[PDB]
């Protein structure tokens, strides 16, 4: 996955 941090 990509940058999935909120």
């Amino acid at each position, epitope marked *: *996955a*990509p*940058d*999935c*941090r*909120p």
Partner: single-chain antibody
Amino acid sequence: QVQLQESGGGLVQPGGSMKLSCVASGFTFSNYWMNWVRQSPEKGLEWVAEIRLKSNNYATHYAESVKGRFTISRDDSKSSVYLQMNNLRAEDTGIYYCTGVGQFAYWGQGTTVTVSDIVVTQESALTTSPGETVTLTCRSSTGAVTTSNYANWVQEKPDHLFTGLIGGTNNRAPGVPARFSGSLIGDKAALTITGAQTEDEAIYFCALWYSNHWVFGGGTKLTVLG
């Protein structure tokens, strides 16, 4: 709230070098990956490079078109990201944007550089009126779009002003109006405007993730009449 301020563009010769800079404020820069994306009339919106976090050893990835010529770097103590561009070609001409966060909420104003395969498909144009519901779609040449493509939607208004709307398929970016929503419908990604407004006249781009790179669609010109 958030500002990404680019600099360093110009008018350069084929074969030359140039370094772009982007300074961030209003969010915790060091906690997010950063990207460079470029726009040209010929090749549309094109993802160029990403850089990850200190905890990832600042891992980088590049588009095949720039690999071995471009280098992305960051300085967390200055909240800045950079793009070193060597051996420039005519095809590198465009407006260069730094962008990131969930996954393309925030965009810089762009800096112009003038030098002198998966296909993601969107509707070329759609026409609506105020108060209507309009749905834009985003198809992959690879097959069905899934949540593993982390579909993003971004809006371009004059003059080359980008704002991210939706990331991770259906997550609305902070401060984005409630009339915008993301979905997956019939194995395409979709952006719906539930009650279109005159100010929503704009170009809308989708971006899909494939393992380690982004592919942007061609954009949809939405006209809002009446």
